[PDB]
Amino acid sequence: EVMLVESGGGLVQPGNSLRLSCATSGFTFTDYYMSWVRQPPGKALEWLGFIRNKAKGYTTEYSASVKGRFTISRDNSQSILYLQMNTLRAEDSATYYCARDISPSYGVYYEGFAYWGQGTLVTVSAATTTAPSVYPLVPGGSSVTLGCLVKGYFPEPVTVKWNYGALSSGVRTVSSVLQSGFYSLSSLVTVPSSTWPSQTVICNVAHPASKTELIKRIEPR
Amino acid sequence: IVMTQSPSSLAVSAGEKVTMSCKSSQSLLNSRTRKNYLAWYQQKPGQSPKLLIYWASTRESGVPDRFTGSGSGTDFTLTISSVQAEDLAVYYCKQSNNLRTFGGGTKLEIKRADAAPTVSIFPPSSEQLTSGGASVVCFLNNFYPKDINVKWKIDGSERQNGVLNSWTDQDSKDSTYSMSSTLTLTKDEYERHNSYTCEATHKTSTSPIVKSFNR
Ligand SMILES: C=CCO[C@]1(C(=O)O)C[C@@H](O)[C@@H](O)[C@@H]([C@H](O)CO[C@]2(C(=O)O)C[C@@H](O)[C@@H](O)[C@@H]([C@H](O)CO)O2)O1
Ligand SMILES: [Mg+2]
Predict the structure, then answer these.
(1) Which residue among A66, A100, A126 closes a domain?
(2) Which residue spans within A34-93 are E strands per DSSP?
């Protein structure tokens, strides 16, 4: 099972520097080019640069946009790819992916990115890292609509689950909205009236920028 | 190299055919390998990109016949023979003949039959009021098209301030939208009044749908 996992993302002050990591497994790390790609919120993908496989000397090549700013390196013993970001600013606020590029020297070779990481969001601001507060949403039929109201967090993002992933149908997460420097979103689930309140209903709010998980059980009034 | 896509977005009905363009500034044809170094990626909301087509026309393991990449040199085309609900995503083309460069992207949206919202209203929670906060939420669930209006009334007067609306992404299963309209007050502003109303106006009907509650 090929796996790519980005780490290091969060909130960085403007002008400062940040290093991202990308742990790999499931393939012969040294056989592959590794590429970094970024994506600002609601924008197009941007390739940033890569580092080649062992056979090619592990040389680096970058995109015009980040020459002299972004640096790529790799630890070949732990099979980890790296991205160094210096003099960060607003335009750098984006989701950063690592991707498995080509291996032309050994094995199966075709032009394309077969595997991408889940991504790690970096936001460049001077503001404050503040975890979200979670309030329940309950009615004042044959089915009933519940949900969790999430306010007062920064930066993005937050992820909302229900029953720890077991409840996945009828789930509607609305986009976030920005006001007074703080974000807010509400996720709602719909279930048969027999499932609630007789049975348990929980939402799992996660805010990676503060290493936080909040749980909120939905109870009647 | 410069990559450029068209259209930036388009909407079609399930079963309809669709075509997306990709253009580069320099031929992506490698004389040494005799192959066009262009790939198509699919990216659904909140996910990572997934590779669909590579070397211009070769389909990647697991991707349906419906998808068909064509082109050579500087003009390429991704073509879905028949779109269904899953295809909700932005499609990116990427050249790799000289380093790598992505296109701008084509967002694929779906047209479906008109649908009316199911409207729920929610009084503020206890723990929020305990912290001096009062947020009233109106939820519009499973409608189409996406354009919809919500009016708030307190005791018979249309409120406008402290209101924030937010939509979801087009649903991957029935291609509808849901939206929330939040009225945010302080515990004092809220205990000041009693009647709270939200009315959803949508093309589906002339007269808005009403949901209310009394503190
Ligand atoms: C002529 C340039 C490079 O040739 C070598 C090399 O000098 O290392 C040797 C060649 O036999 C061949 O292995 C190429 C290799 O195909 C280059 O691959 C890249 C690259 O920059 O490393 C990446 C590929 O995806 C593609 O962009 C090619 C490009 O088509 C030019 O060949 O370059 O390396
Ligand atoms: Mg070189």
Answers:
(1) A126
(2) 34-39, 46-51, 60-62, 70-75, 80-85
A120-124 vs A10-12, strand pairing mode: parallel
Cβ-based contacts of B99 with chain A (< 8 Å): 47, 49-50, 61, 63
Provide the number of structural domains found in chain B: 2
Structure method: X-ray
Range of the domain at A105: 1-126
Q: Report the domain count for chain A.
A: 2
Expressed in Å, this structure's resolution amounts to: 2.8
Instruction: Give the residue whose CA is nearest to atom 32 of ligand 1.
Output: B97
3-state SS assignment for residue B190: helix
Q: How many CB atoms are located within 10 Å of the residue A83 CB?
A: 25
What letter does residue B123 receive in the DSSP assignment? P
Q: Do residue A45 and residue B120 have CB atoms under 8 angstroms apart?
A: no
Residue A205 and residue A147 in contact, taking contact as beta carbons nearer than 8 Å:
no
- Taking the C-alpha atoms of residue A202 and residue A217, their distance in angstroms, rounded to an integer, is 4
CATH code at position A212: 2.60.40.10
Residue B79 sits in the same domain as residue B159: no
Residue B145 to residue B52: CA distance in whole angstroms: 29
**CB–CB contact B105 A37 (8 Å):** no
The parent domain of residue B82 ranges over 1-112
Are B51 and B62 within 8 A, CB to CB? no
Please give the full DSSP string across A117-178, using - where no structure is assigned.
---EEEEE-SS--BPPEEEEE-----EEEEEEEEEEEBSS--EEEEGGGT--SS-EEPPPEE
CATH number of the domain bearing residue B61:
2.60.40.10
The reply to whether B170 and B212 lie within a common domain is yes
Q: Which residues pair with B107 in a beta bridge?
A: B9, B90
Domain end point (choices A95, A126, A157): A126
Same domain (yes/no): B106, B175 = no
CA A144 to chain centre: 31
Distance from the CA of B37 to the center of ligand 1, in angstroms?
12
Q: Which two tokens stand for residue B176?
A: 């509808």
Same domain, B129 and B61: no
